[PDB]
Amino acid sequence: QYLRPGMVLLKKFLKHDDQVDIIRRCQKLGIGSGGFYTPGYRDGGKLSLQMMCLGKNWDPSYGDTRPFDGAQPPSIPEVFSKIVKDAIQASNEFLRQKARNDVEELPPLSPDICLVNFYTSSGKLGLHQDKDETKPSLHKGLPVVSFSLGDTAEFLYGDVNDVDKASKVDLESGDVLIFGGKSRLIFHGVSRIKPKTAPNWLTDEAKLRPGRLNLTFRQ
Ligand SMILES: O=C(O)CCC(=O)C(=O)O
Numbered sequence: 001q002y003l004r005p006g007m008v009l010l011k012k013f014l015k016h017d018d019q020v021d022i023i024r025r026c027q028k029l030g031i032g033s034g035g036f037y038t039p040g041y042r043d044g045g046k047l048s049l050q051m052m053c054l055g056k057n058w059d060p061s062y063g064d065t066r067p068f069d070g071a072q073p074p075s076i077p078e079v080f081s082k083i084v085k086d087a088i089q090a091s092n093e094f095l096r097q098k099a100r101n102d103v104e105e106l107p108p109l110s111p112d113i114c115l116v117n118f119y120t121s122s123g124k125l126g127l128h129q130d131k132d133e134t135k136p137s138l139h140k141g142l143p144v145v146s147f148s149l150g151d152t153a154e155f156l157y158g159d160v161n162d163v164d165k166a167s168k169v170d171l172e173s174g175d176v177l178i179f180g181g182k183s184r185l186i187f188h189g190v191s192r193i194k195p196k197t198a199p200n201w202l203t204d205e206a207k208l209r210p211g212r213l214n215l216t217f218r219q
């Protein structure tokens with residue numbers, strides 16, 4: 001649960017039907033206009049990764065359409081935003097209960113982007129900061145809220161671009177991870193996808209392919 005100031009991991013936060021619904025909506029959004037593509041560049045490097053944005057588009061920074069094909073991203077489903085807000089509320093309640101030092105509290109989020117990352121089993125994403133948001137967003141420490149579904153990721157995090165100084169946590173299917181405030185500019189990334197770790201009920205009900213779906217909400 002508490003990983004460092006303003007960084008909370010909510011285990012198995014996503015409900016059954018919400019996990020299925022997320023996958024089904026992403027499968028459909030993923031094949032249409034503004035769907036998944038293989039990025040030519042990601043800060044930190046990458047392997048076996050495809051992405052698509054909902055809300056604002058995030059290109060190699062932010063815009064209304066993808067330059068390479070002109071497609072407008074699908075908007076962020078209202079259910080996704082609701083679950084983001086619930087995660088932030090639950091984290092703030094936890095932080096209030098944990099207070100001994102200042103009381104910690106994460107800023108609210110009204111996300112206008114969702115980056116959807118899909119990793120196959122050989123997937124990885126190198127260490128980087130989420131630093132492309134506007135200066136006021138960053139200065140306010142508005143959090144990043146990350147959903148995990150499917151196979152488990154080994155997620156690295158730390159203060160610098162060196163794995164030797166990074167911590168590791170597993171992000172398992174259903175987990176929501178939040179980093180804001182003093183943790184907003186952590187270096188972070190995905191070192192490994194653990195094969196064959198997605199819950200069977202999810203693979204079966206959502207017809208989920210091998211790998212991991214991440215949704216990362218910001219601004
Ligand atoms: O897949 C993850 O959990 C990391 C997502 C991420 O850091 C990003 O795409 O900016």
Ligand SMILES: [Mn+2]
Nearest residue numbers: 128129130188
């Ligand atoms: Mn990131």
